[PDB]
Design a protein around this ligand. Structure first.
Ligand SMILES: OC[C@H]1O[C@@H](O[C@H]2[C@H](O)[C@@H](O)[C@H](O[C@H]3[C@H](O)[C@@H](O)[C@H](O)O[C@@H]3CO)O[C@@H]2CO)[C@H](O)[C@@H](O)[C@@H]1O
Ligand code: CA
Ligand code: CA
Ligand code: CL
Ligand code: NA
Length: 614
């Protein structure tokens, strides 16, 4: 595949745009995304709309969201020129601002931080697009009486790092970001505890495995980078004495949404040259790359036979990407032999997930050779039926998403249900996006992004009636109809859907009868009103019945949710024999089997959205 790292960077940022919750801007690039989560915060009296969905679900998990914004801002801080020359800087700022705007909303009071919207069990029990979520979406906070030093520190780091990269183009927004970062850090430092002991739902999805000591250091050093005030460097260095004996600092994991030790110590190593941080950074990157020498033995992470540095079963590519990013940053800082080894490690790991692997395929949706087609992602899939296997192929392309990827033997399945292979998440793409920026800097000379991209997707049929003839006679026709909302471009809730069923009364008028003599009556009925005949074209004796499910919510969210049924009969007076359905517009092609028909037009709030009128 002929790699284009400007296009890749453009796509990775487009994944974050696909993750947006809230009210979307008019110039949104993704026509298959619409407004969603508009009631977020209403249970607690607050506007908590916006931010990112975490993954293929619709929970806004504060700890990985803060981490993702912080790492995204970190790469803009390190590689601004790469973002600039690839044409992606405006997009990178716009996409980070979506998350930091949400943190500002969530940070309502100096010592209060909304850290989740959405309940994991309620959210994940339902498989459908964001715009038509039917369930309650409770909001959860930390505060001084139930704190969260990890969540609060990690969010302070996101605001502090973002404040740096926003200062050149929007200094008043930068000042606001920095003022909230200082308050959140004081919150984190003064009111100590793991946020998942207070937003207990988070224990089941984003548990604070490592505790908060790492976020305390991470927040303080980002505040130092963002202010150059010595007090923050001292606080960072003081917080490191709670890491204990430097000889026992962990080195067998990597930078991750839960453990930012690896980011903090790398930033402190550059600021201090203190051998405690240098050695700990090098133990970690040695372990990930050529092996960590005890002089006795060499200790090294598992590698797949295809060359992927393999931490564990879930989000394997995310881990190798996270490590590659630390390796790139270290390798631009210092001039040691290890810088070259780590730089080569980082490139090879990045080349693996871009296609240089045994599956001979890209692991970035919508990029490269044979990319994953079935990422585990509700809105991109576009189910109308609350089923992961309906439809059998995704309705939309989740461009830029890095999937979980292969197992330890390089095995991989492009399957919507295979969470290990095909999970996607904002933390998966965060360091990865920076790695792409660096690939552009190193190898992307002359790479330009895609113009006018993405093209708007052409919708399939979204609103339509399937209909069949119950019975027909020389004085009546009786119809079975199911009015469908299978929308996806974007999915939309509709509680004012209607259809019209048209007839030609020419044979009636010739027999001495008129529209007055035809009675329209409902039989089995899931909530529609059926009108008497109304004229469509009086000169030609064309009439219709308007069948309206006014106030009935219909939406692409399950087998019953997406359709409503009504059976209705049009009857001439008993004993007459003129009635003739064969010249009736909406009778055309109907059979005794329920089938979509283009001749029963469908209206939403009075607006024609499907089908043909006479
Ligand atoms: O406690 C010290 C030990 O730490 C180990 O690293 C842990 C990280 O600190 C922790 O953040 C990570 O949490 C993972 C979690 O295990 C996983 O289930 C979830 O999906 O992602 C989290 C974030 O990546 O767990 C690791 C491993 O336990 C060191 O590896 C170890 O050497 C050290 O003793
Ligand atoms: Ca932590
Ligand atoms: Ca007729
Ligand atoms: Cl349903
Ligand atoms: Na497919």
């Amino acid at each position: 595949y002929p790699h284009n790292y400007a296009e890749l960077l453009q796509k990775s940022l487009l994944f974050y745009e696909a993750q947006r919750s809230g009210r979307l801007p008019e110039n949104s690039r993704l026509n298959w995304r619409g407004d969603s989560g508009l009631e977020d915060g209403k249970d607690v009296g607050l506007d908590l709309t916006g931010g990112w969905y975490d993954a293929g679900d619709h929970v806004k998990f504060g700890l990985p969201m803060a981490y993702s914004a912080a790492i995204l801002s970190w790469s803009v801080y390190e590689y601004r020129d790469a973002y600039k020359e690839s044409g992606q800087l405006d997009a990178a700022l716009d996409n980070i601002k979506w998350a930091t705007d949400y943190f500002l909303k969530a940070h309502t009071a100096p010592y209060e931080l909304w850290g989740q919207v959405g309940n994991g069990a309620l959210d994940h029990a339902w498989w459908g697009p964001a715009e038509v979520m039917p369930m309650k979406r409770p909001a959860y906070k930390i505060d001084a009486g139930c704190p969260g030093s990890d969540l609060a520190g990690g969010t302070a780091a996101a605001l502090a790092s973002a404040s740096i990269i926003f200062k050149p183009t929007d200094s008043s927004y930068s000042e606001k970001l920095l003022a909230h970062a200082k308050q959140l850090y004081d919150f984190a430092d003064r009111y100590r505890g793991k946020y998942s002991d207070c937003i207990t739902d988070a224990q089941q999805y984003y548990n604070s495995w490592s505790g908060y000591k790492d976020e305390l250091t991470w927040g303080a050093v980002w505040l130092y980078l963002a202010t150059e005030e010595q007090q923050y460097l001292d606080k960072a260095l003081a917080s490191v004495s709670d890491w204990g004996d430097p000889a026992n600092w962990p080195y067998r994991w990597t930078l991750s949404w839960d453990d930012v030790t690896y980011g903090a110590q790398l930033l402190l190593a550059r600021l201090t040259n203190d051998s405690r941080f240098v050695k700990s950074v090098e133990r970690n990157l040695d372990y990930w790359s050529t092996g960590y020498s005890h002089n006795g033995s060499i200790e090294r992470i598992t590698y797949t036979p295809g060359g992927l540095a393999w931490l564990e079963q879930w989000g394997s590519l995310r881990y190798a990407s996270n490590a590659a990013f630390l390796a790139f940053v270290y390798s631009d800082w210092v001039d040691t032999e290890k810088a070259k080894r780590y730089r080569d490690f980082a490139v090879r790991q990045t080349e693996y997930m871009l296609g240089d692997n045994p599956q001979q395929r890209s692991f970035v949706v919508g990029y490269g050779k044979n990319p994953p087609k079935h990422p585990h992602h509700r809105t991109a899939h576009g189910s109308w039926a609350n089923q992961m296997n309906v439809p059998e192929n995704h309705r939309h392309t989740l461009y830029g998403a890095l999937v979980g990827g292969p197992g330890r033997d390089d095995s991989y399945r492009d399957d919507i249900t295979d969470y290990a292979s095909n999970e996607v998440a904002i933390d998966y793409n965060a360091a990865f996006t920076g790695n792409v920026a660096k690939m552009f800097q190193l190898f992307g000379k002359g790479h330009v992004p895609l113009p006018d991209f993405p093209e708007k997707e052409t919708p399939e049929d979204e609103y339509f009636a399937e209909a069949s003839i119950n019975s027909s006679g020389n004085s009546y026709t009786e119809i079975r109809a199911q009015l469908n909302n299978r929308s996806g471009w974007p999915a939309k809730k509709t509680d004012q859907l209607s259809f019209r069923y048209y007839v030609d009364l020419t044979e009636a008028v010739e027999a001495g009868y008129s529209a007055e003599d035809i009675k329209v009556t409902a039989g089995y009925n899931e909530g529609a009103s059926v009108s008497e005949l109304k004229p469509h074209d009086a000169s030609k004796h064309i009439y219709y019945t308007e069948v309206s499910f006014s106030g009935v919510l219909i939406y692409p969210g399950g087998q019953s949710a997406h359709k409503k049924e009504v059976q209705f009969r049009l009857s001439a007076p008993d004993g007459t024999s003129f009635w003739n359905p064969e010249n009736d517009h909406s009778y055309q092609g109907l059979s005794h089997a329920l089938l979509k028909t283009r001749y029963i037009p469908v209206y939403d709030d009075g607006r024609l959205v499907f089908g043909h009128e006479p």
